[PDB]
Every structure is written in C-alpha cells, then in structure tokens.
Design a protein around this ligand. Structure first.
Ligand SMILES: Nc1nc2c(ncn2[C@@H]2O[C@H](CO)[C@@H](O)[C@H]2O)c(=O)[nH]1
Ligand SMILES: Nc1nc2c(ncn2[C@@H]2O[C@H](CO)[C@@H](O)[C@H]2O)c(=O)[nH]1
Ligand SMILES: Nc1nc2c(ncn2[C@@H]2O[C@H](CO)[C@@H](O)[C@H]2O)c(=O)[nH]1
Ligand SMILES: Nc1nc2c(ncn2[C@@H]2O[C@H](CO)[C@@H](O)[C@H]2O)c(=O)[nH]1
Ligand SMILES: Nc1nc2c(ncn2[C@@H]2O[C@H](CO)[C@@H](O)[C@H]2O)c(=O)[nH]1
Ligand SMILES: Nc1nc2c(ncn2[C@@H]2O[C@H](CO)[C@@H](O)[C@H]2O)c(=O)[nH]1
Lengths: 234, 234, 234, 234, 234, 234
C-alpha cells in the first residue's frame, strides 16, 4: 500500500478523475456515482469509486500544486489507474475568457518545479493523451457546452504572478493559470498512462475572489460531466 | 517587400504548406497544384503558389532549423499567411516507429535556441493550433495511411543527439526528432495564426543513410495529401 | 476572507504551528489545546485555535509541497500570523539519522519551484527567523530530547530522489528531505513574520515504508511539545 | 555519402568558403573560381569546387542559422574540409559601422542554441583558428581594404532582437549580428579543422531592409577576395 | 606543503580568524595575540599564530572574493584547522544598518561562482556551523555590543550591484553584501569543520569611499573580540 | 582615491602589466623596470610604476580570482590605465602542454561568477583586445620563444576541477586553466581599454604541486619580456 493514498488493489478503478479540492470530489461522488465508496481520506486526500452508467469510475483528490498531485498521481498508477483526467478550476489570464466558461487543455506551460525535477531541468511540452484530449473536446462539443481549446500554465507561486505578468503570458497562448496539469501530463507519458485535463474558469487574475456561486458551479458541473463521458469513451 | 521571402503583396495564399527541403516544395507545387507560380527563389527558399481543388494554396521552403524557419514564417505572415502547416521529415526516437510512418505533431519539445530567444528563456509548450491539429488527425484517418499522433522534439545540433540520448527522450513521450515545429508552433500563437505539423519518419536515430527512397517518397506523398486536405478544413 | 483558508481575523492567533497533514493537526489541537476551535476545513486545510498554557495558539494545515504550504502561510499572514513554526516529518538523507529523531531546521536547501518562482531565478539561502530557530534549539536541550541542528532540502518530486542522490546531498549537509520548509523561510522574510521549523524523521529515503509506529508518534509528539513551548517564548 | 551534402570525398577541396546564400556561392564560383563545378545542390545547399590561382577551393552554401550551418560544416569535414572560412553578411550593432565595411571576426558571442546543444549548456568562447584569423586580418591590410576586427554575435531569432537590445550588446564589444559564426568556431575546435570568419556589413539594426546596392556588393567582392587570398596562406 | 598558504602543519592552530585584508590580520595578531608569529607571507596571504588567553589562535588572510577565500579555507583545513571564523566588513543593503553596526551571519546568499562550481549549479543554503553561529551570537550579547543577526549575500562583482538591486535584495532579507562567507560555509560542510562569520558594516552600497574613520574602526575591534571569545568556547 | 588600489592621480601609467602574485610584481618591478617606485600596498595589492626603455609602465597585483582582479582592473582604468595585460600562470588541460611553455590567450572561457554577474547570465566570448593580442603573438615570435596560441578557461574553484574534466575541456579547445582572464577581457570591452594575457604553464591539472623552479622561472621571464615589448606596441 502507498504512503499517501493508502488504498489496496481493487479500490481504484481504470478510469479516474482527479480533483484538487477534496470537496468537489465528494460532491462528484454523491452526485454522479452509484453506491459511491470512499477508499481513502488520509491527508484529506479524499477518494471514491462508484459507477457511472455501469462503468466503474474513480475520483481521487490531488491537492494543490504539482508536488502533491504528482505524489497522488504516481500512487494511483501503482494502484491501477490507467486513464486519469483533471477536473479543476483556473484563473483567466486574458479578458476574452469569462468565468464559468470551460477550457480543454491542449498542453501546459511547465512553470512548476515538480516537472522540472523529473526532467532534470530539460525543456518539455506537457500534453495530454491525444485520445483523452480528443475525447474531452468531443464530449464537450457533443453536449453543447461552450468551451475553449488551448493552453494553460502550471505555476507554483499562487500569489507571485501579477495581472501584468499574466497579460504577457497570454500573448504566448496561455489562457489561464492552474497548478497540476503539467505534472499530470508528464507522469502521464513517463509512466505509460493516458491523462487529460478540463478546467472551469472561476475568476480572472487580478481579483481577490471566485465567481457568483451559480455561474462557476454550473461550470464545475458541466466540466465533471464531459470528463466522465470522455473516460468511458477512451 | 520582406527581406528573405521576397514575395509581393499578392503572391502568398492564406493556406500554406511548409516543407524544409526546397526540393520537396517544388515537387508538391508540380504534383498537386494547378497553375503553380514560383513567387520567390532568393536564398534558395523556393515558394510556390497555385490552386488546389479550386482553393488557393502556397508552398514555402523554410530551410533547416528554427532560425531559418522563423524568418520564413515571420515573413509569410506579413505576406498573408493564415494557415501554415509543416510538411517535413523526422528521425524516430526509438524502434516502435518505422520509416515512412506518419506523425501528426500534437506538440514539440523545444530543444532549440530560436524559441528560447523568443521566450527569453521562459518555459513553454509548443503546440499547434488545436483546430488544424484536429483536421490533420481526421484526414490522416480518412485517407487511412499508417500514422501516429504525439510529441516530436525540435533540436538544433542534428549531429549531437546520440541513439542512447534519443531513447531517453522516448521515455519522455517523444516519438521522433525534427528541426522546425517548435518555433512554428510558438510563432503561431505569438502572431495569431493557425499552424500545424505533419512529419514522415525518414529513419531511426543512429542510422548512417536513410532507408529505401521509394518507401520514403511514398511516405512523403501521403503526408502532403493529408496536409493539403487538412488545410481546406480550416 | 482568504481565498483558501476561509477564515477571518481573530480566528487565527499570533503564534501558529504548521503540520503538513490535517490528521496530525487535529491530534495536536484536541491533545494540547483547550477549547480548540476549527475555524476552517476548506480544501482539507483544517485550521484550529485554542489555549495552550494560557496563550492562544493555532494549528494550520499547509498541505503537501511548498506550493500548498505557500498559500497557507501567505493567508495566515493576511489573517494576522506573526510566529509560524512548521512541525513536520522528513526523510533522512544520511545513514546516521535515526527514525523518530528530531531536526531543528537551520535552513532549507531550495530545490522547489515555489521559492524559485518567488525569487525569479535568484540564488538564496532560506533560513528561519533567528530567534525562533534559537527557541526550538534551546528547548530541545532543556527537554533532553535527542535532536540535530542543520540543513534540510525542500523538493517537489517526492518520488524522484533516489538514495544515491540523497547521500550525495548529505555530503553538503542535507540532513533529510522535506517539502515545505524553504518557502516558509522565504516568505518569513518576504512578509515580515517570524518562522521556524522542527522535523521528525519518519524514514530513510528510498524506503517504501516507515518504522515502528510507536517511535514515529513519540517523535512527533516531542516535536510539538518542543514547538508549542517555543512559539510562546517569541 | 553524407545526408545533406550529397557528395563524394574528392568532390570537396581542403580549403572552403562558406557563404550563407547559395546565390553568392554561385556568384563566387563564377566570378572567382577557374573551371568551377557544382558538386551538390541538394536542399539548395549549392556547392562548387574549382581552382583559385591554381589552388583548389570550394564554395559551399551553409544556409541560415547555426543548425543548418552546423550540419553543413560537420559533413564538409567528413568530406575532407581542413580550412573553412565563412564569408557572409551581418547587421551592425552600432551606428558607427556602415554598410559595406568588413569585419574579421575575432570571436562570436554564442547566442545560438546549436552551440549550446553541443556544449550541453557550458559557457564558452567561440573563436576562430588563430592562424586563419590572422591571415584574414593580414590580407585585409595587404589589400588595403579598410575593416574592423572584433566580436560579432550569433543569434537564432533574426526578428527577436530590437535596435535597443542590439546596441545594448554593443557596450560589450559586439560589433554586429549574424547567424553562423559561433557554430563554425566551436566545431573548428571539436573536429580539429581550421576555421575563420569575415563579414560585409549589410545594414544597421533597426532598418526594414538594407542599404544602397552597389555599396554592399563592393563589400562582398572585397570580402571574398580577402578570404580567398587567406585560405591559400594557411 | 599547500600551494598558496605555504605554512607548516604545526603553524596553523585549530581555531582561526579569517580577515579578508592582510592589513587587519597583522593588526589583529598584534593587538590581541600574545607572542604572535607570522607563519606565511606568500602571495601576500599573511598568516599569524599566537595565544589568546592560554589558547593558540591563528589569523589567516583570505583575500577578496570566494575564489581566493576557498583556496585559503581549503588549505587551512588540510593544515589541521577545525574552527574558522570570518571577520570581515560588508556593505549595508538597506537604511537600518548604519556603518559600525555588527552582523552575525545566519546564512549567506550564494551570488558567487565558487560555490556554484562546487555545487555544480545545484541550489543551496550556505550556512555556518550551528554551535559556532550560536557562540558568536552569545558572546555579542555577553560583551554587550549592538548587533544584528541575519543574511548577507556573497557576490563576485563588487562594482556591479547597484543601489537599487541592493534594496531589491533587502526585500528578501539580505542585511549586507560581502565577498566570502558563502564559500566558507559551503566548504565548512563539505570538509566537516566549524565555520562562522561576523561582519562590520563599512558603508551603504553606492558609496564612493567610506565613513567616519573613528566608527568603522571601533566596530571592527568589537567584532574581532566577539570572534576571538567565541572560538574559545567551541 | 580608489577604495582598494589607493593610488593618487598620475601614479599609474597608461601601460600596465597584471601579475596575480604580489611577489611577482615586485620582482618584475625590480627586474625589468628602471627606477621602480611602489604606489600602493593597501591589501597586499602591490603596485609599481617605473620605466621600460624610457616608457612609463606599471605592474599591479590583481590577487587571485576574478572578483579580485575585477576590482583592481575597475580601479586602474578609473585611474587612467589604458593598456592592461595579464602576465600569470595556468595549469595545462592535457599532456599537450608542458611546464614552462607560454600561452598567448586568444580567448577566455568564462567559468567564473564575476563575468557572469556583470553579464547577468548572458552568453559571451571574452577575447583580448585584437591589437594587443597580436603584439603579444608578434613579440612572442620575434623573441624566438616557443609558445601556443589559443583558449584558456577562467574558473572560480581552484580545487574543484578534476583531471578528467580538464580533459573534457581540452576536447573543446581549452589549453589551460587559470583565474583572471575572463573578467579582464570583459572589462576590457566594457570600459574601453586594451587588454591581453600571456601565461606560463606551471603544471598539469591533477598534480598536488609545481614543476622544476628553474624551468618555470624562465617561462615567467619570457612571458614578462614578451608583455613588456608588446605593451609598447599599442
Ligand atoms: N495558480 C492558480 N491556480 C488557480 C487559480 N484559480 C484556480 N486555481 C486552481 O485551484 C487551486 C488554487 O485554488 C490550484 O490547485 C489551481 O489548479 C489561479 O488564479 N491561479
Ligand atoms: N534533428 C533531426 N531532424 C531530422 C532527422 N531526420 C529528418 N530530419 C528533418 O529533416 C532535416 C534534417 O535532414 C531537418 O530539417 C529535420 O526537420 C533526424 O534524425 N534528426
Ligand atoms: N520529500 C520528502 N518528504 C518527506 C519524506 N518523509 C517525509 N516527508 C514529508 O511528508 C510529506 C511526504 O509524505 C512531505 O510533506 C514532507 O514534508 C521524504 O523522504 N521525502
Ligand atoms: N541575426 C542577423 N543576421 C544577419 C543580419 N544581417 C545579416 N545577417 C546574416 O544574413 C542572414 C539573415 O539575412 C543570416 O544568415 C546572417 O548570418 C542581422 O541584422 N541579424
Ligand atoms: N561586495 C561587497 N563587499 C564589501 C563591501 N564593503 C566591504 N566589503 C568587503 O571587503 C572587501 C571589498 O572591499 C570584500 O572582501 C568584502 O568581503 C560592499 O559594499 N560590497
Ligand atoms: N585554476 C587554476 N589556476 C591556476 C593553475 N595554475 C596556475 N594558476 C593561476 O595561479 C593561481 C592559482 O595558483 C590563480 O590565480 C591562477 O590564475 C591551475 O592549475 N588552476
């Protein structure tokens, strides 16, 4: 059994969804999974397994920052995870992106040290599994939920980045900022597993808060659905 | 008129293919375009323009390496380019990819100094325009030629990379090595244009001479077809 | 109201202890604090407050990795924290440190990208607040608890570091490897608060499992005693 | 036979001039070489060999950029090149250097990524072969053609540097910018062959094109003469 | 015998004060040492050995900059040195450190290349030996002289750092700029010896000369005393 | 009055030789200069100004390391120094160079932190002033003294380079290792003065000492002689 996500074989499922917030996790469990079960809760890393249209699905809590995610991801794989999709939030770096809108992450600028440490300092292009990426983009499109398809950025210092610094990054193709996608993608390739990431804009960089409960909450919901449907596909 | 690609106000089309070998360029313009016209030969950077299935299409030689390629791209853009797709060759990072196989660049691991100079040393994830990428994958499917979808890596010292080094990069998801994608993908986002890349494996890193030219020429043809069909998609 | 540690001024007491996993927080709260009040549980960042020997002391969850620890320390500062000491666990890099022993953080070798992004590439030497450091030190002696005073390393990739890399680092002085010390020390100076760090060696790098539960809890128990007594002396 | 310079052993002399643009290669071959013969035109890398004052000399196109130039040089040495002199143009980094003036490159600040790949990121000082360097200088004086002797800078991204950043480098001794020298100088030392570089200023950094036509040409003619005289001396 | 400090093993004592200027060494040796004798004067690295209250103590010159300092510290270790304390001057980075004030070095920010070459580009936290650090501190209060305890930055280019950049560092907690501590501390750990540093502020970066001849000299004296006492304990 | 080199205006000549050893300075002053007169002794940085064949010339100790030399060069130039040439020692990188041999420094690989601080981490090619570089070479020949022409490597940590690494560097053209060239060369350009460096090989990297004192001394005498003839040239 792992050191963090203390689970034994049989708990985790093939397809797994990775949420940073232990809350959204639970809310996913109770809201989309039949007879959801919680295999782990150690370190607040709440994780559940239930069924979605029969198919076994999982929902494991990564935490905040590629370091924590990496630890959980690495362990979910050792436990049996084959298809993991991130279900999180982000901070818009532009203005064209309004809160609640969804983003299918094409790739992730590695502004984190975790991927760096794994790459021993080498450059890289973290990208999801083309099948998963394709799947998310397709279930989104099929469901009719307006979205965006592009780049994000996985930083480490939440309060370091400034609106201005973000404006510049946007000129490079970055749409918003998150804190786990880059590592998910690296390990994804590194360990021979398919990974993906879908994000809900919960605010624009420069402002001290999230979005009017309902606006973002729908997003968080649309996102979670597209995710689930995509995995069952891959 | 641009410094290198000395084309005029009305010579370049919105949809352009970017081969590195001026030789391949000319061949495409003759084998696929109607009423083909060479608008430039300065510096051996042959660029042709004509009609493909009633749609205006251009073929511009980029040369080898991102330094050469960024100059050409930067100039195609101020010349009208809007959809630029790279039709090139690459060396497989490992043995699971044979010569003549197609690779649809999902992203490019930036091991070049050109993107490094443009990004002032900042990390980044050179990825194509999702739309164009999506197309390339579909026409590759439609036409039904043996291919792959994933990461390639753009290097600078062609003769630097060792077979041992390549295989390590393979353990990071890189399927093959080439010398342009990265910058194109970068400039694409920087100058708001949709770009893409499709490569035809011409050898496995470590070989003295490329494999049977008949098998590589056919690989090339398939690539150019997909690419041309895909540019009409966007 | 912080964006992550959804609290309010008055909830957090000047002197604060910072454990990595909430489970250990609760323990400390319920165990050493009278009338403990968990003012936050958002994102699993369990944060309590209560009386210790007649002085309001707090217990805040940082999460794993300096990225998560950064946000917590950054908000704890916005709420009114002045004396923040981390009470954690680490993996010994040397073959001389015994499981269950204590380590007073004289400094933290910055091997994480959080501190890095906050410094913008600049070289630094992350150290605690002079006094706190001196506090943790003088107590651990008056309390006859065998401990060590020296350097620890702060990393992002928990599973990257192999025993061999660890011994190498031990040659420079790294006693063990943890994951929150550096950014805590950094922010200490950056924000103006007094920080510190004491740790419990839970294992020897490269090993899949800790040692006898009994020993590891008495090491942590001690750690908090040596800690709580200090935050009051400064 | 090499991959890019499809030529046989005896198709290349011991002494070689390396112009970046194939049109000048051809011009040189015709304007200066006796009984010159084109031994390659693959990928537009026009290469001619003939006699200059009874001695054989080759004029080989390198292409734009160190990656391309590196490939060319590597194969040339494989082909028997022993003395390679780059004969190209450059953008002045200061208002004192006027179009047409010549520059005997004493060294090249390595702003390119090719050298870096070969240097695995180590610092370095790309300098020519002392004997070659001195002959160029000497002949320039012998021919009474005015010139400058100093550093040039080799970059990757032509359109990245601005009039500001360039003259900034001037304050470090950078006379002008180009895109091949550094890789040539490094490889000269790595493979053990004598290399040198001379340049015809084609414009001042900040201008949309170049200067008055005849001026530059007379500069190029002098440049090639100096280079030709020199290679026969070493 | 060592290449630079040409002394005999019996010459260097266990405890050693490390002044940067040979003028201060000679002074120390003659002001505080009983029956002092110079054991070396090669390369002007004046080194003296004497008795300070029954105990033998050496005062070795290091020169300016970590390269000179590292050469010295390395050879002193090889000649039996166990405890080395740097008694140098420094430049205030902020306005709260009027010259004459004392600084007990807790850590030294590595802005030098000596520690960079040793560490092989790896990050680090140069710090003194705990017990030695503790001693200096205690003796300063004991003897009762106004002092400050914190960080100092070790740089290579004295005339580089500008008045602004200093305040920029002040914001990360740098108390002053000197030129040796970092390497002394790194070697301290590598070669297993006890090192420390107590500085005497001489100016405020951006200063052309110095301050009141009177003040600076008194501060220096106290310094040498806090240092001489200290070493006696450890 | 400069801070370190406390010389009055007019004490230092236009031409100056730069030995790193104050013992060598005095010897040079009293060996080759007519009417030698020391103008500074502060910090063992011995400085002399006498006459060489009627021409005023100064010899100024730089100390060991680029941070030191950098300081003295900055100060001499501010004093009026115009032609500064280093006359020092260095250890051969391979069996290619024997003790007592002269090296005319064509360029200096910057492995030091000083040039890196000035340069702000940017790549660079430290070269001597072209005319001075030439006069040295020119005088080397006329005098009949056996010498090599090429690269050296200016490093910071004397005791850090392994014999192995020296060989790795030889592969890239580095002839020997020393500790001042690079900075002297960067300041040369930065401050508009003419510089150069001639070296006497005193050993091979690896050996714990030096060669036969009578062998090296003649190398030193030839070195100085060449430099003196040279400085009068420009
Ligand atoms: N860095 C960053 N992460 C954000 C932002 N908004 C939401 N997040 C995500 O949610 C967490 C922070 O609450 C991180 O794990 C991110 O992935 C933002 O503006 N910046
Ligand atoms: N770097 C690299 N490029 C290759 C290889 N094989 C084909 N190419 C491509 O074709 C050119 C080199 O022949 C470059 O422009 C590449 O994009 C290979 O093994 N390595
Ligand atoms: N990186 C690292 N963290 C450790 C180790 N042992 C305990 N930890 C700590 O506990 C968490 C990982 O379980 C991190 O938050 C660390 O601070 C170890 O061997 N390595
Ligand atoms: N980077 C750069 N290369 C230049 C410039 N002017 C001429 N060149 C040279 O000519 C090509 C660009 O036109 C490159 O191959 C360079 O070697 C200039 O201003 N900048
Ligand atoms: N870098 C630096 N060193 C200083 C300063 N003031 C005194 N020093 C010290 O004294 C020498 C420079 O005079 C160096 O050896 C330093 O350790 C200052 O402002 N900056
Ligand atoms: N780094 C280094 N410097 C050397 C060597 N031999 C002589 N030196 C020079 O002389 C001093 C070291 O003795 C430094 O100031 C160098 O410039 C050597 O082998 N390595």
């Amino acid at each position: 059994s792992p050191i963090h996500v203390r689970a034994h074989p049989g708990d985790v499922a093939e397809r797994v969804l990775l949420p940073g917030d232990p809350g959204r996790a639970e809310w996913i469990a109770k809201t989309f999974l039949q007879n959801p079960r919680r295999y782990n809760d150690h370190r607040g890393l709440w994780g559940y397994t239930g069924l979605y249209k029969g198919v076994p699905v999982s929902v494991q809590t990564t935490g905040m920052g590629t370091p924590s995610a990496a630890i959980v991801v690495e362990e979910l794989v050792r436990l049996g995870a084959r298809v993991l999709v991130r279900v999180g939030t982000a901070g818009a770096a532009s203005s064209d992106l309004a809160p609640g809108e969804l983003i299918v992450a094409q790739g992730a600028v590695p502004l984190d040290g975790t991927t760096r440490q794994y790459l021993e300092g080498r450059p890289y292009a973290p990208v999801p599994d083309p099948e998963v990426f394709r799947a998310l983009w397709r279930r989104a499109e099929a469901l009719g939920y307006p979205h965006r398809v592009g780049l994000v950025a996985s930083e480490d210092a939440f309060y370091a980045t400034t609106p201005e610094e973000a404006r510049a990054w946007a000129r490079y193709g970055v749409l918003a900022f998150e804190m786990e996608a880059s590592a998910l993608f690296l390990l994804g390739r590194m360990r021979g597993v398919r990974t993906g990431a879908i994000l809900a804009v919960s605010n624009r960089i420069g402002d001290p808060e999230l979005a009017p409960p309902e606006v973002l909450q729908e997003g968080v919901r649309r996102m979670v659905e597209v995710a689930l449907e995509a995995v069952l596909e891959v």
